[PDB]
Design a protein around this motif. Structure first.
Motif, PDB file in Angstrom:
ATOM      1  N   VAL A 127       0.851  -1.194   0.000  1.00  0.00           N
ATOM      2  CA  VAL A 127       0.000   0.000   0.000  1.00  0.00           C
ATOM      3  C   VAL A 127       0.888   1.246   0.000  1.00  0.00           C
ATOM      4  CG1 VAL A 127      -1.737   1.343   1.271  1.00  0.00           C
ATOM      5  CG2 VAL A 127      -1.997  -1.129   1.061  1.00  0.00           C
ATOM      6  N   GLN A 128       0.954   1.904  -1.156  1.00  0.00           N
ATOM      7  CA  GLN A 128       1.844   3.045  -1.360  1.00  0.00           C
ATOM      8  C   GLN A 128       1.078   4.335  -1.646  1.00  0.00           C
ATOM      9  OE1 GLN A 128       4.388   1.610  -4.570  1.00  0.00           O
ATOM     10  NE2 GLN A 128       5.903   0.824  -3.108  1.00  0.00           N
ATOM     11  N   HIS A 129       1.673   5.460  -1.263  1.00  0.00           N
ATOM     12  CA  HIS A 129       1.101   6.776  -1.528  1.00  0.00           C
ATOM     13  C   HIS A 129       2.198   7.707  -2.040  1.00  0.00           C
ATOM     14  CE1 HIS A 129      -2.181   5.260   1.080  1.00  0.00           C
ATOM     15  NE2 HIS A 129      -1.196   4.861   1.864  1.00  0.00           N
ATOM     16  N   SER A 130       1.884   8.479  -3.078  1.00  0.00           N
ATOM     17  CA  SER A 130       2.858   9.391  -3.674  1.00  0.00           C
ATOM     18  C   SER A 130       2.963  10.690  -2.872  1.00  0.00           C
ATOM     19  CB  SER A 130       2.522   9.667  -5.145  1.00  0.00           C
ATOM     20  OG  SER A 130       1.252  10.277  -5.275  1.00  0.00           O
ATOM     21  N   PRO A 131       4.159  11.312  -2.861  1.00  0.00           N
ATOM     22  CA  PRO A 131       4.378  12.520  -2.067  1.00  0.00           C
ATOM     23  C   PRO A 131       3.732  13.774  -2.650  1.00  0.00           C
ATOM     24  CG  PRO A 131       6.335  12.019  -3.349  1.00  0.00           C
ATOM     25  CD  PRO A 131       5.400  10.858  -3.525  1.00  0.00           C
ATOM     26  N   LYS A 132       3.188  14.612  -1.772  1.00  0.00           N
ATOM     27  CA  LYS A 132       2.800  15.969  -2.135  1.00  0.00           C
ATOM     28  C   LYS A 132       3.971  16.872  -1.779  1.00  0.00           C
ATOM     29  CE  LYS A 132      -1.454  16.596  -0.232  1.00  0.00           C
ATOM     30  NZ  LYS A 132      -2.712  17.396  -0.214  1.00  0.00           N
ATOM     31  N   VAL A 133       4.148  17.944  -2.547  1.00  0.00           N
ATOM     32  CA  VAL A 133       5.318  18.812  -2.408  1.00  0.00           C
ATOM     33  C   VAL A 133       4.929  20.289  -2.411  1.00  0.00           C
ATOM     34  CG1 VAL A 133       7.572  19.434  -3.384  1.00  0.00           C
ATOM     35  CG2 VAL A 133       6.767  17.081  -3.557  1.00  0.00           C
ATOM     36  N   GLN A 134       5.453  21.045  -1.445  1.00  0.00           N
ATOM     37  CA  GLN A 134       5.331  22.505  -1.444  1.00  0.00           C
ATOM     38  C   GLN A 134       6.699  23.168  -1.293  1.00  0.00           C
ATOM     39  OE1 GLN A 134       1.918  24.841   0.057  1.00  0.00           O
ATOM     40  NE2 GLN A 134       1.415  23.038   1.302  1.00  0.00           N
ATOM     41  N   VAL A 135       6.964  24.168  -2.132  1.00  0.00           N
ATOM     42  CA  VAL A 135       8.207  24.942  -2.079  1.00  0.00           C
ATOM     43  C   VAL A 135       7.853  26.395  -1.795  1.00  0.00           C
ATOM     44  CG1 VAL A 135      10.377  25.482  -3.247  1.00  0.00           C
ATOM     45  CG2 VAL A 135       9.117  23.427  -3.879  1.00  0.00           C
ATOM     46  N   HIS A 188      10.788   9.358  -5.628  1.00  0.00           N
ATOM     47  CA  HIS A 188      10.110   8.356  -4.818  1.00  0.00           C
ATOM     48  C   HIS A 188       9.713   7.180  -5.699  1.00  0.00           C
ATOM     49  CE1 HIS A 188       6.842   6.806  -2.065  1.00  0.00           C
ATOM     50  NE2 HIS A 188       7.833   7.021  -1.218  1.00  0.00           N
ATOM     51  N   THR A 189       9.603   5.998  -5.095  1.00  0.00           N
ATOM     52  CA  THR A 189       9.264   4.770  -5.828  1.00  0.00           C
ATOM     53  C   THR A 189       7.905   4.846  -6.548  1.00  0.00           C
ATOM     54  OG1 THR A 189       9.197   2.329  -5.716  1.00  0.00           O
ATOM     55  CG2 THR A 189       8.290   3.530  -3.821  1.00  0.00           C
ATOM     56  N   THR A 190       6.977   5.630  -5.997  1.00  0.00           N
ATOM     57  CA  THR A 190       5.651   5.822  -6.593  1.00  0.00           C
ATOM     58  C   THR A 190       5.680   6.657  -7.873  1.00  0.00           C
ATOM     59  OG1 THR A 190       5.286   7.700  -5.094  1.00  0.00           O
ATOM     60  CG2 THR A 190       4.309   5.586  -4.467  1.00  0.00           C
ATOM     61  N   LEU A 191       6.755   7.419  -8.066  1.00  0.00           N
ATOM     62  CA  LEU A 191       6.849   8.363  -9.179  1.00  0.00           C
ATOM     63  C   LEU A 191       7.547   7.775 -10.404  1.00  0.00           C
ATOM     64  CD1 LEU A 191       7.909  11.578  -7.188  1.00  0.00           C
ATOM     65  CD2 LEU A 191       5.604  11.103  -8.030  1.00  0.00           C
ATOM     66  N   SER A 192       7.001   8.073 -11.583  1.00  0.00           N
ATOM     67  CA  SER A 192       7.554   7.607 -12.862  1.00  0.00           C
ATOM     68  C   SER A 192       8.820   8.374 -13.234  1.00  0.00           C
ATOM     69  CB  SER A 192       6.521   7.772 -13.981  1.00  0.00           C
ATOM     70  OG  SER A 192       5.264   7.236 -13.606  1.00  0.00           O
ATOM     71  N   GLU A 193       8.898   9.615 -12.761  1.00  0.00           N
ATOM     72  CA  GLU A 193      10.036  10.497 -12.990  1.00  0.00           C
ATOM     73  C   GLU A 193      10.188  11.424 -11.781  1.00  0.00           C
ATOM     74  OE1 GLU A 193       9.417  13.162 -16.300  1.00  0.00           O
ATOM     75  OE2 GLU A 193       7.833  14.243 -15.231  1.00  0.00           O
ATOM     76  N   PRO A 194      11.347  12.107 -11.652  1.00  0.00           N
ATOM     77  CA  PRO A 194      11.500  13.076 -10.562  1.00  0.00           C
ATOM     78  C   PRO A 194      10.418  14.159 -10.599  1.00  0.00           C
ATOM     79  CG  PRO A 194      13.613  12.683 -11.634  1.00  0.00           C
ATOM     80  CD  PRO A 194      12.576  11.985 -12.464  1.00  0.00           C
ATOM     81  N   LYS A 195       9.828  14.447  -9.440  1.00  0.00           N
ATOM     82  CA  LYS A 195       8.872  15.543  -9.295  1.00  0.00           C
ATOM     83  C   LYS A 195       9.652  16.833  -9.050  1.00  0.00           C
ATOM     84  CE  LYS A 195       4.700  17.407  -8.079  1.00  0.00           C
ATOM     85  NZ  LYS A 195       3.441  17.395  -8.875  1.00  0.00           N
ATOM     86  N   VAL A 196       9.506  17.796  -9.957  1.00  0.00           N
ATOM     87  CA  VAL A 196      10.218  19.071  -9.849  1.00  0.00           C
ATOM     88  C   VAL A 196       9.228  20.218  -9.678  1.00  0.00           C
ATOM     89  CG1 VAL A 196      11.785  20.716 -10.961  1.00  0.00           C
ATOM     90  CG2 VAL A 196      12.207  18.258 -11.187  1.00  0.00           C
ATOM     91  N   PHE A 222       3.464  10.537   1.927  1.00  0.00           N
ATOM     92  CA  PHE A 222       4.126   9.471   1.178  1.00  0.00           C
ATOM     93  C   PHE A 222       4.410   8.215   1.992  1.00  0.00           C
ATOM     94  CE2 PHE A 222       8.473   9.836   2.695  1.00  0.00           C
ATOM     95  CZ  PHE A 222       8.553  11.146   3.144  1.00  0.00           C
ATOM     96  N   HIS A 223       4.440   7.088   1.278  1.00  0.00           N
ATOM     97  CA  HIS A 223       4.843   5.788   1.804  1.00  0.00           C
ATOM     98  C   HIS A 223       5.264   4.951   0.589  1.00  0.00           C
ATOM     99  CE1 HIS A 223       5.023   2.710   4.905  1.00  0.00           C
ATOM    100  NE2 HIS A 223       4.526   3.580   5.767  1.00  0.00           N
ATOM    101  N   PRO A 224       6.375   4.208   0.657  1.00  0.00           N
ATOM    102  CA  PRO A 224       7.195   4.003   1.858  1.00  0.00           C
ATOM    103  C   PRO A 224       8.140   5.172   2.204  1.00  0.00           C
ATOM    104  CG  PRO A 224       8.135   2.804   0.018  1.00  0.00           C
ATOM    105  CD  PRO A 224       6.850   3.398  -0.484  1.00  0.00           C
ATOM    106  N   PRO A 225       8.846   5.089   3.360  1.00  0.00           N
ATOM    107  CA  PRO A 225       9.611   6.228   3.894  1.00  0.00           C
ATOM    108  C   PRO A 225      10.827   6.689   3.086  1.00  0.00           C
ATOM    109  CG  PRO A 225      10.050   4.255   5.173  1.00  0.00           C
ATOM    110  CD  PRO A 225       8.883   3.941   4.287  1.00  0.00           C
ATOM    111  N   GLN A 226      11.547   5.772   2.440  1.00  0.00           N
ATOM    112  CA  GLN A 226      12.730   6.167   1.658  1.00  0.00           C
ATOM    113  C   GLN A 226      12.348   7.114   0.519  1.00  0.00           C
ATOM    114  OE1 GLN A 226      13.114   2.394   2.628  1.00  0.00           O
ATOM    115  NE2 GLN A 226      11.030   2.534   1.824  1.00  0.00           N
ATOM    116  N   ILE A 227      13.073   8.226   0.427  1.00  0.00           N
ATOM    117  CA  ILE A 227      12.741   9.318  -0.488  1.00  0.00           C
ATOM    118  C   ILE A 227      13.967  10.206  -0.721  1.00  0.00           C
ATOM    119  CG2 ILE A 227      11.894  10.905   1.312  1.00  0.00           C
ATOM    120  CD1 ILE A 227       9.564  11.577  -0.744  1.00  0.00           C
TER     121      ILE A 227
END
Lengths: 275, 99, 9
Positions: free
Chosen positions: B2-10, B84-92, B31-36
């Motif tokens: 059970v995985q969840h993708s990270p939300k990001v704010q800059v 993150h493992t959930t992402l197809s490419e780096p989130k920028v 996000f899950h899992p913790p490694q990021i």
């Protein structure tokens, strides 16, 4: 109002490289005050708030001893669950635990809680009565029977009704100068043209504590918060929080819009519009 | 699994004023899992920064804050890059002084 | 203060 003391444990296995990485963090309300990270030659429990620095060596030695023993039990737990779930040692896995106590303004207990995870899913949780357990799968049912036999729920009940509430009261008094005084948000409306026809009005709330806040937009004295974009409340980095809410409006129509802000620090809730 | 993708704010700590010292934040949550992999960047190049102790919400999903001091200017581009493992490419996510 | 070490899962 209500106050809370909370702890958050995370353990992540490291296949073929040694012991799991273990992190523990403690919070009074929204304020972090203690930390532990297993990744150090001689790791200790450490302060993360100025008001807990006062505690003598006795306190720090006891917290360190408890957290290091907890780190070791979380290490055996990860190994145990590889057996329960018949999983390979080569793959990394993780377990979390969060527990705490919520108290009333006078100090009396409102609720105690404790929950355990495995790989991001509920594993086992202490029930509301603090006398029984809810197990999420057949592996967790093994744990449940084991903890029932060991009288684990009684020890948690003792801690949550006793030590947890008593020490929260001590922490609140130790840091009354910061924890007990609400910090009001600094608020403003900014204007950002998209074109000659459309304009973004962003309502800012900055530098507030605690994190709980309400931002709403009105147009012609009618609620239109459903049209707004609201960002998740975010940490400023200095122990305070930030949030904004924005609407896209027709150019020339900005005086029809009002942003309303409710926060514990405000003696009066504020309504703002573009100047 | 059970995985969840990270939300990001800059974002900055205080309202940005060109040539005035400030603090740059990249807040990553849910996000899950913790490694990021979370990286603050100046003009597409890594800034050395600091990352808070791993903590999580009631739903088990983690949150992290990556931060460093910075002095915003007219010219310099700031961003955060998340892997993150959930992402197809780096989130920028680019830093925008108005958000 | 934290809770003391728990029993194994």
């Amino acid at each position: 109002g209500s106050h809370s003391l909370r702890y958050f444990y995370t353990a992540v296995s490291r296949p073929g490289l040694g012991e799991p990485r273990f992190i523990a963090v403690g919070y009074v309300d929204d304020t972090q005050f203690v930390r532990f990270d297993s990744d150090a030659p001689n790791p200790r429990m450490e302060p993360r708030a100025p008001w807990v620095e006062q505690e003598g060596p006795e306190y720090w030695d006891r917290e360190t001893r408890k957290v290091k023993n907890t780190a070791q039990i979380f290490r055996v737990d990860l190994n145990t669950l590889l057996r329960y779930y018949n999983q390979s040692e080569s793959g990394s896995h993780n377990i979390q635990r969060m527990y705490g106590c919520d108290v009333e303004p006078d100090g009396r207990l409102l609720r105690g809680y404790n929950q355990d995870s495995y790989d991001g899913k509920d594993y086992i949780a202490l029930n509301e009565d603090l006398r029984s357990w809810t197990a999420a799968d057949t592996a967790a049912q093994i744990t449940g029977r084991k903890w029932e036999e060991a009288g684990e729920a009684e020890r948690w009940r003792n801690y949550l009704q006793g030590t947890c509430v008593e020490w929260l009261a001590k922490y609140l008094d130790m840091g009354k100068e910061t924890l007990l005084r609400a910090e009001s948000p600094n608020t403003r409306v900014t204007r950002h043209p998209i074109s000659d026809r459309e304009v973004t009005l962003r309502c800012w709330a900055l530098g507030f504590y605690p994190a709980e806040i309400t931002l709403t937009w009105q147009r012609d004295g009618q609620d239109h918060t459903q049209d707004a974009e609201l960002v998740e409340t975010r940490p400023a980095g200095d122990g305070t929080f930030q949030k904004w809410a924005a609407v896209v409006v027709s150019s020339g129509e900005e005086q029809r819009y009002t942003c309303h802000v409710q926060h514990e620090g405000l003696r009066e809730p504020i309504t703002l519009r573009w100047e | 699994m059970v995985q969840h993708s990270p939300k990001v704010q800059v974002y900055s700590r205080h309202p940005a004023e060109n040539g005035k010292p400030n603090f740059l934040n990249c807040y990553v949550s849910g996000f899950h899992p913790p490694q990021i992999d979370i990286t603050l960047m100046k003009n597409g190049k890594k800034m050395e920064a600091e990352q808070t102790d791993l903590s999580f919400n009631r739903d088990w999903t983690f949150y992290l804050l990556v931060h460093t001091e910075f002095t915003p200017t007219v010219e310099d581009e700031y961003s955060c890059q998340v892997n993150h493992t959930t992402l197809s490419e780096p989130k920028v996510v680019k830093w925008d002084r108005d958000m | 203060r934290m809770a003391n070490v728990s029993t194994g899962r």
